[PDB]
Amino acid sequence: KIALVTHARHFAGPAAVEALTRDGYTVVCHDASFADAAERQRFESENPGTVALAEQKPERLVDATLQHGEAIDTIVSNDYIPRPMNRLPIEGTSEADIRQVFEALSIFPILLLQSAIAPLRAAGGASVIFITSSVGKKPLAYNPLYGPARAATVALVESAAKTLSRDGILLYAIGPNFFNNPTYFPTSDWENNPELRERVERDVPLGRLGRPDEMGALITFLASRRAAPIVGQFFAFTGGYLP
C-alpha cells in the first residue's frame, strides 16, 4: 500500500509522511533536496518506511514511484512556495517571480495529475489530495499572486473530479491556514514570536494552530476512501477562520 508525497520536507509533507507511515503505508517521497544522494540516504535512514526519489520532474514522479511497487493508493500533491514569496504583491514583482508562483502551485500539480491518470485508472482507482491554501477559496490582501495560483488548483480539483471519480480516482483539496508546519507556521515562530499567538487568539475560533497529527488524520481519513462521496471538494483546515 503505497503513497507518493511531494515536497516531503515542507508544508504538510511531514504531517502526511508520519501519518501515512503510521497507517501502514510505504511512503515514496519527492523533494528538491533529493537530487543529492546524501540527502536521499539521510531522509530514508531517518524516516523508516519511506523511499526518497531522485526524480525532480513533476511528470516523472509517478513512474518513479511505480519502480517501488505495483500500484499507488494515494498521491499527496503538497505544493508550496517559500515565505516571503507567498506575500508577493502585484506592483513591482518581476515577471519571473509571477511565473514561478504559477509554476510551483498550478502547473506542477497539473503535470503531476496528468501523468497519474492512466496508471491510477489501470489499478482500479486511488486518492489524489492536493494541499493548497485557505486563499484557494477566500482572498487575502497580501496574497494577490499566491491566491490566484492556489485558486487554480482548487478549481482543478473541482473540475477534474467530475470525470475522474467514475474511474475511482478521488480528488480532494485541503486549504490550510494557521496550521503548525515548517513552511508557514513553524513551531519556532509560535514560541518565539509573540505576534503570531495574539492574532491566533483573535482570528481563529479554535484558539490554536492546527496540529501536525490533525492534518495527518484528515489525510489518512481521505486516503482510506471510507467516505468517498465527499470526493471533489475543498476542505478548510483553519480552525474555523474560514468560511
What is the chain's length? 243
Binding to a second copy, residues 70-129 (CB under 8 A) = 89-91, 93, 95, 98-99, 102, 106-107, 110-111, 113-114, 117-118
Q: Whose Cβ is closer to Cl ion: residue 36's or residue 191's?
A: 191
Indicate which single residue of 130, 179, 184, 185 sits in contact with a second copy (rule: CB under 8 A). 179
Edge to edge, the sheet with strand 234-237 lists: 50-52, 26-29, 2-5, 74-78, 126-131, 169-176, 234-237
Applying CB under 8 A, which of residues 158, 186, 190, 197 lies at the interface with a second copy? 158
Q: Which stretch binds Cl ion (CB under 5 A): 45-53, 97-105, 169-177, 216-224?
A: 169-177
Q: Which of 138, 189, 190, 196 binds a second copy (CB under 8 A)?
A: 138
Segment interacting with Cl ion, rule: CB under 5 A, options 48-56, 59-67, 171-179, 211-219:
171-179
Q: Segment contacting Cl ion (CB under 5 A): 28-36, 43-51, 91-99, 176-184? A: 176-184
* 184 in contact with Cl ion (CB under 5 A): yes
Q: Is 6 in the site for a second copy (CB under 8 A)?
A: no
Does position 14 bind a second copy by CB under 8 A?
no
Task: Tell which one of 149, 181, 185, 200 touches a second copy (CB under 8 A).
Answer: 149
Which residues, other chains included, contact 72 with Cβ-Cβ below 8 Å and sequence gap of 6+? 2, 3, 4, 62, 65, 66, 116, 119, 120, 123, 126
Residue nearer to a second copy on the CB measure, 27 or 116? 116
**DSSP class per residue in 188-242:** HHHHH-HHHHHHHHHH-TT-SPBPHHHHHHHHHHHHHTTTGGGTT-EEEESTT--
145 makes contact, choosing from a second copy, Cl ion, none, with CB < 5 to 8 Å by partner type, with a second copy
Residue 69 touches which of a second copy, Cl ion, none (Cβ within 5-8 Å per kind): none
Cα–chain center distance at 120: 18
For a second copy, which stretch binds (CB under 8 A), given 26-34, 36-44, 159-167, 186-194? 159-167
DSSP states of 105-124? IIIHHHHHHHHHHHHHHHTT
- Residue 34 near Cl ion by CB under 5 A: no
Counting residues that bind Cl ion (by CB under 5 A) gives: 3
CA–CA dist 22, 86 (Å, integer): 31
Residue closer to Cl ion, measured from CB, 184 or 234: 184
Can you tell me the distance from the alpha carbon of 171 to that of 35, in angstroms, rounded to the nearest whole number? 28
Query: What angle do the packed helices 146-164 and 95-102 form, to 10 degrees?
Result: 30
Q: Which three cell numbers stand for residue 240?
A: 474555523
Handedness of CA 11, 17, 73, 233 (dihedral sign): negative
Q: Which positions touch Cl ion (CB under 5 A)? A: 176, 179, 184
